[PDB]
Design an enzyme around this catalytic site. Structure first.
Site, PDB file in Angstrom:
ATOM      1  CD  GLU A 234      15.902  -3.984 -18.864  1.00 57.00           C
ATOM      2  OE1 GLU A 234      14.934  -4.409 -19.613  1.00 57.00           O
ATOM      3  OE2 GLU A 234      16.771  -3.121 -19.251  1.00 57.00           O
TER       4      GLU A 234
ATOM      5  CD  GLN B  95       3.342  10.204 -13.628  1.00 52.94           C
ATOM      6  OE1 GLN B  95       2.938  11.328 -13.284  1.00 52.94           O
ATOM      7  NE2 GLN B  95       2.467   9.506 -14.130  1.00 52.94           N
ATOM      8  N   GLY B  96       6.928   7.127 -11.822  1.00 53.51           N
ATOM      9  CA  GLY B  96       7.697   6.423 -12.595  1.00 53.51           C
ATOM     10  C   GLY B  96       8.709   5.665 -11.748  1.00 53.51           C
TER      11      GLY B  96
ATOM     12  CB  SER C 207       5.648   4.679  -7.432  1.00 54.45           C
ATOM     13  OG  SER C 207       5.090   6.017  -7.478  1.00 54.45           O
ATOM     14  N   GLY C 208       7.901   2.658  -5.914  1.00 51.66           N
ATOM     15  CA  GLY C 208       8.021   1.164  -5.779  1.00 51.66           C
ATOM     16  C   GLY C 208       9.645   0.993  -5.530  1.00 51.66           C
TER      17      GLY C 208
ATOM     18  CG  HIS D 263       1.406   3.697  -5.276  1.00 49.49           C
ATOM     19  ND1 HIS D 263       2.308   3.914  -4.491  1.00 49.49           N
ATOM     20  CD2 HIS D 263       1.390   3.967  -6.506  1.00 49.49           C
ATOM     21  CE1 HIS D 263       2.859   4.658  -5.256  1.00 49.49           C
ATOM     22  NE2 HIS D 263       2.568   4.878  -6.345  1.00 49.49           N
TER      23      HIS D 263
ATOM     24  CG  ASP E 184       2.490   2.580  -1.330  1.00 45.48           C
ATOM     25  OD1 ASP E 184       2.000   1.720  -1.985  1.00 45.48           O
ATOM     26  OD2 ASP E 184       2.956   3.764  -1.833  1.00 45.48           O
TER      27      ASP E 184
ATOM     28  CG  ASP F 250      11.166  14.873  -5.023  1.00 48.45           C
ATOM     29  OD1 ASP F 250      10.033  15.350  -5.226  1.00 48.45           O
ATOM     30  OD2 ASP F 250      11.188  13.816  -4.266  1.00 48.45           O
TER      31      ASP F 250
HETATM   32  N1  LIG Z   1       7.513  13.430  -5.649  1.00 48.85           N
HETATM   33  C1  LIG Z   1       7.685  12.263  -5.454  1.00 48.85           C
HETATM   34  N2  LIG Z   1       8.696  12.026  -4.667  1.00 48.85           N
HETATM   35  C2  LIG Z   1       6.954  11.298  -5.937  1.00 48.85           C
HETATM   36  C3  LIG Z   1       7.526   9.743  -6.148  1.00 48.85           C
HETATM   37  C4  LIG Z   1       7.098   8.951  -6.644  1.00 48.85           C
HETATM   38  C5  LIG Z   1       5.756   8.933  -7.231  1.00 48.85           C
HETATM   39  N3  LIG Z   1       4.895   8.316  -8.185  1.00 48.85           N
HETATM   40  C6  LIG Z   1       4.090   8.839  -8.366  1.00 48.85           C
HETATM   41  C7  LIG Z   1       2.760   8.486  -9.020  1.00 48.85           C
HETATM   42  C8  LIG Z   1       2.130   9.409  -9.996  1.00 48.85           C
HETATM   43  C9  LIG Z   1       1.094   9.089 -10.647  1.00 48.85           C
HETATM   44  C10 LIG Z   1       0.786   7.654 -10.820  1.00 48.85           C
HETATM   45  C11 LIG Z   1       1.823   6.701 -10.082  1.00 48.85           C
HETATM   46  O1  LIG Z   1       1.652   5.314 -10.104  1.00 48.85           O
HETATM   47  C12 LIG Z   1       0.557   4.616 -10.907  1.00 48.85           C
HETATM   48  C13 LIG Z   1       1.069   3.995 -12.398  1.00 48.85           C
HETATM   49  C14 LIG Z   1       1.500   2.801 -11.836  1.00 48.85           C
HETATM   50  C15 LIG Z   1       0.531   2.319 -10.556  1.00 48.85           C
HETATM   51  C16 LIG Z   1       0.143   3.612 -10.058  1.00 48.85           C
HETATM   52  C17 LIG Z   1       2.732   7.157  -9.275  1.00 48.85           C
HETATM   53  O2  LIG Z   1       3.568   6.433  -8.555  1.00 48.85           O
HETATM   54  N4  LIG Z   1       4.054  10.311  -7.991  1.00 48.85           N
HETATM   55  C18 LIG Z   1       5.120  10.248  -7.265  1.00 48.85           C
HETATM   56  C19 LIG Z   1       5.847  11.565  -6.814  1.00 48.85           C
HETATM   57 CA   LIG Z   2      17.380  -3.047 -21.593  1.00 46.43          CA
END
Ligand SMILES: NC(=[NH2+])c1ccc2[nH]c(-c3cccc(OC4CCCC4)c3[O-])nc2c1
Ligand SMILES: [Ca+2]
Length: 223
Positions: free
Chosen positions: A52, A174-175, A177-178, A40, A84, A171
């Site tokens: 970094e 957002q940010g 992910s990956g 995603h 994913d 936890d």
């Molecule tokens: N509670 C958690 N463990 C969690 C972990 C990773 C997440 N990543 C995201 C997330 C939310 C909105 C948009 C995202 O990615 C979009 C922006 C980059 C492309 C997809 C997220 O990864 N929510 C997340 C929640």
């Molecule tokens: Ca830097």
């Protein structure tokens, strides 16, 4: 990362930032030319930033390399987030050293209770948005499949596992992910999704990397 701590500069040498004019997802360096991230996080125009710590300041040790191609798993389902995982091939190989190093893929899946390290530049607030300049870390355990499926009924597949704290407070968010979930020096998970961040009884869900090692190896071997 909510409830975590500052890792310390370059203490997680396999962590990468995917960048398109801003940091949008994390990833892990598995060899000098490939990175593993989440499907995603796929977009075009990805510049992979290695070495970094502060992503807004060039402090030294950074290597900025463009992605030559991104391979989203063919069975990735964007509605369930099943499979994913994504592989990114770098335009040139990175120079590995003590600050930029790859992490090993696992030979066996990890058991519940295993303590892992999760890291990233994601939001540090559960209620609101505060994005850090430096890398944050969180030590969290893998939960049992029964606790995970009880928390998210009908949404957990065999390619996912939960890690975290049911009491809330710590936890990934957002940010993040990956990015990486490393347990005893092996990459066992990829930050995938969660319900909010650090809420009680809603642990984070991760892609179970041990189920994809042959897929990763065969794909890298043919590209
Ligand atoms: N509670 C958690 N463990 C969690 C972990 C990773 C997440 N990543 C995201 C997330 C939310 C909105 C948009 C995202 O990615 C979009 C922006 C980059 C492309 C997809 C997220 O990864 N929510 C997340 C929640
Ligand atoms: Ca830097």
């Amino acid at each position: 990362i909510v409830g975590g701590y500052t890792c310390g500069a370059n203490t997680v040498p396999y962590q990468v930032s995917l960048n398109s004019g801003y940091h949008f997802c994390g990833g892990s360096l598995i060899n000098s030319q490939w990175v593993v991230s989440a499907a995603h996080c796929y977009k075009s125009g990805i510049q992979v930033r290695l070495g970094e710590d502060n992503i807004n300041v060039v402090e030294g040790n950074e290597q900025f390399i463009s992605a030559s191609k991104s391979i989203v798993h063919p069975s990735y389902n964007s509605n369930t987030l099943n499979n994913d995982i994504m592989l990114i091939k770098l335009k040139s190989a990175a120079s590995l050293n003590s600050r930029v190093a790859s992490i090993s893929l696992p030979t066996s899946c990890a058991s519940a209770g295993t303590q892992c390290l999760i890291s990233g530049w994601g939001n540090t607030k559960s209620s609101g948005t505060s994005y850090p300049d430096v890398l944050k870390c969180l030590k969290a355990p893998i939960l049992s499949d029964s606790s995970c499926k009880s928390a998210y009924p009908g949404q957990i597949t065999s390619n996912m596992f939960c890690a975290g704290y049911l009491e809330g407070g710590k936890d990934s968010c957002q940010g993040d992910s990956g990015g990486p979930v490393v347990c005893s020096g092996k990459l066992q998970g990829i930050v995938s999704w969660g319900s909010g961040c650090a809420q009680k009884n809603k642990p984070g869900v991760y892609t179970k990397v041990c189920n994809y090692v042959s897929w990763i190896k065969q794909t890298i071997a043919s590209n």
